[PDB]
C-alpha cells in the first residue's frame, strides 16, 4: 500500500478573456486593463497652470477686446478656450489665424511691453462704437488706430531695434474701409499701404475697399498680422494710410505651454494628463478617451479595451 502525489495548478470559477497570437479569446485566471477609457469629466487645476478663457479666445485676449482686459497680466501652461467665447470689438480677421493662435499659445504669456513709437502728424487712439469702453467708443487695448491730423496723413516711418535677448512679437493690422469716402475721410490718400519689415523679411499689405456684411454696426474690417523680431534685428513700419499700429510687443518665451478647446469645468485635483473630456489617469500605457491630450498621457489608440494577462490559462474543475 503506497501513495499518490498529484501536481497541479490553481483555477478560479470566473476567469477573464484575453487575446493571443493564436486566439481572439482565451480564458486566463486574471488580467489587467491597458486602455484608459474613462474620465472624471473635469480638468484638474494641478499640476499644470490652467487658464480658463471663459468668454474669450486667446486671440481676443491678445488683441485686447475690452471684455478680455482681465487677461492682460496672464500666463498659462494650458489655455482653455470655451465654445461660448465671443468677440465684441472691431470686426476683424487674421490671415493665418491658426498660426498666430499656435505661436501665442506656445509662448504661454500675454506679457506686453509698451514702446514709445512716435507717430508724427497723425491722430492717435481712434475708437469705435463696435468696441465700447465705459460710456464711449473704444478699441483693442494693444492696438493704436491712427487717422489723419488736420487735412494730412504723412508717410509714417518708424523703427524699433531689438536690443534685448528675447524675441519680440509685434501685433499690427490694416484697416479695410467699406467706401472711398471713408478711406479719404480717415487717411486722405485714396489707397493706403502698410509695410512692416525686419532685416531679412517683409510683409506689404494693400487695403481693400468694399461693402461687407454688418457686424456690430460696421461693414469695415481690420486684418491682423504679426512680426517676430529676433535679438539684434530691427522692426521698421512704413505706411501712408490704414495702419493699425502696435503699441509695443509681447515678450516671447519657449516652454511647455499650449491651448485646448474644451467645455469641461476646472476642478481642484491633481492630474498629469488633460483631455478635452477632462483629466484622465496615466497609470495605463494606452487610452481611448481623446486623441487631443496635454501632459504625461497614455498614447491614444482605437481599441476601447486591451487585456494584459496576469495569470495562467484558467481550466476550471
Amino acid at each position: 500500500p503506497g501513495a499518490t502525489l498529484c501536481l497541479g495548478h490553481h483555477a478560479v470559477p470566473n476567469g477573464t478573456l484575453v487575446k493571443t497570437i493564436t486566439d481572439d479569446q482565451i480564458e486566463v485566471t486574471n488580467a489587467t486593463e491597458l486602455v484608459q477609457s474613462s474620465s472624471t469629466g473635469k480638468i484638474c487645476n494641478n499640476p499644470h497652470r490652467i487658464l480658463d478663457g471663459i468668454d474669450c479666445t486667446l486671440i481676443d485676449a491678445l488683441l485686447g477686446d475690452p471684455h478680455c482686459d482681465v487677461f492682460q497680466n496672464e500666463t498659462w501652461d494650458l489655455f482653455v478656450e470655451r465654445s461660448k467665447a465671443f468677440s465684441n470689438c472691431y470686426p476683424y480677421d487674421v490671415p493665418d489665424y491658426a498660426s498666430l493662435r499656435s505661436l501665442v499659445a506656445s509662448s504661454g504669456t500675454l506679457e506686453f511691453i509698451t514702446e514709445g513709437f512716435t507717430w508724427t502728424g497723425v491722430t492717435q487712439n481712434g475708437g469705435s462704437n463696435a468696441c465700447k469702453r465705459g460710456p464711449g467708443s473704444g478699441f483693442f487695448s494693444r492696438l493704436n488706430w491712427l487717422t489723419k491730423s488736420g487735412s494730412t496723413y504723412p508717410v509714417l516711418n518708424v523703427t524699433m531695434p531689438n536690443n534685448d535677448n528675447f524675441d519680440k512679437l509685434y501685433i499690427w493690422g490694416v484697416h479695410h474701409p467699406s467706401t472711398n469716402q471713408e478711406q479719404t475721410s480717415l487717411y486722405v490718400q485714396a489707397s493706403g499701404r502698410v509695410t512692416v519689415s525686419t532685416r531679412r523679411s517683409q510683409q506689404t499689405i494693400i487695403p481693400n475697399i468694399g461693402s461687407r456684411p454688418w457686424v456690430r454696426g460696421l461693414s469695415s474690417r481690420i486684418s491682423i498680422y504679426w512680426t517676430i523680431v529676433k535679438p539684434g534685428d530691427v522692426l521698421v513700419i512704413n505706411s501712408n494710410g490704414n495702419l493699425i499700429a502696435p503699441r509695443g510687443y509681447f515678450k516671447m518665451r519657449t516652454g511647455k505651454s499650449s491651448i485646448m478647446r474644451s467645455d469641461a469645468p476646472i476642478d481642484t485635483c491633481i492630474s498629469e494628463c488633460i483631455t478635452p473630456n477632462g483629466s484622465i489617469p496615466n497609470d495605463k500605457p494606452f487610452q481611448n478617451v481623446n486623441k487631443i491630450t496635454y501632459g504625461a498621457c497614455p498614447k491614444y489608440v482605437k481599441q476601447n479595451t486591451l487585456k494584459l494577462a496576469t495569470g495562467m490559462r484558467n481550466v476550471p474543475e
Binding site: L5, L7, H10, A11, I21, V28, C297, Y300, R313, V315
Partner: protein, 171 residues
C-alpha cells in the same frame, strides 16, 4: 501551451487552491491533503510582475502639438494634418494589439512551463521510487507518511532511504 501541462496532461486546475498558483495533492496511509508550492508560484508571479512593470513604464509626455479637430473646411493643409494623426493612431493601435498578443501568448507559455518544471523536478527527486501515471500524478511505491510528503514538497526527500522497499514493490 507549448509544454502541454496546463490544459494538457493535467486535466484541470484546482479552484480550492487559494494560497499558491502551483502545488501538491496527496493520498497516503494518513488521508488526503493539499499544499501550495511557493517557489514555482514565485517564479511565475515575478516574471508576470516584471513584464507588467515593463509595459506600464510611463514613456509619453507631450505639450504643444498639432490641431486634430477643425471647425472649417480648408483642403490641402488640413488633409495632411488629419492624415498625419490618423497614420500615427493606426500605427500605435497596431503596436498595442501586437504587444498584448505577444505578451499574452508568452504569459500562457511561461506559466505552462513553470508547471512542467515543477513536475520534472518532482519526478527527479523521486528517482526509482515512483512512476509517472501520465495525468500529473506520481504513484509512489512505498509507505509515505505525512513527514515523507512534506519532505518531497520542501525538497528534503532522500530516495536511497526508501529505494529497496520501492524497487521491490515495482518489480
Amino acid at each position: 501551451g507549448l509544454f502541454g501541462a496546463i490544459a494538457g496532461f493535467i486535466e484541470n486546475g484546482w479552484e480550492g487552491m487559494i494560497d499558491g498558483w502551483y502545488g501538491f495533492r496527496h493520498q497516503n496511509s494518513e488521508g488526503t491533503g493539499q499544499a501550495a508550492d511557493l517557489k514555482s508560484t514565485q517564479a511565475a508571479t515575478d516574471q508576470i510582475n516584471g513584464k507588467l512593470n515593463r509595459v506600464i513604464e510611463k514613456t509619453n509626455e507631450k505639450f504643444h502639438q498639432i490641431e486634430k479637430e477643425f471647425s472649417e473646411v480648408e483642403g490641402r493643409i488640413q488633409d495632411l494634418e488629419k492624415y498625419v494623426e490618423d497614420t500615427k493612431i493606426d500605427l500605435w493601435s497596431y503596436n498595442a494589439e501586437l504587444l498584448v498578443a505577444l505578451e499574452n501568448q508568452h504569459t500562457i507559455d511561461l506559466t505552462d512551463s513553470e508547471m512542467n518544471k515543477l513536475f520534472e523536478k518532482t519526478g527527479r527527486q523521486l528517482r526509482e521510487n515512483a512512476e509517472d501515471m501520465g495525468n500529473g500524478c506520481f504513484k509512489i511505491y512505498h509507505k509515505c507518511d505525512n513527514a515523507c510528503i512534506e519532505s518531497i514538497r520542501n525538497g528534503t526527500y532522500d530516495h536511497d532511504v526508501y529505494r529497496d522497499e520501492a524497487l521491490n514493490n515495482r518489480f
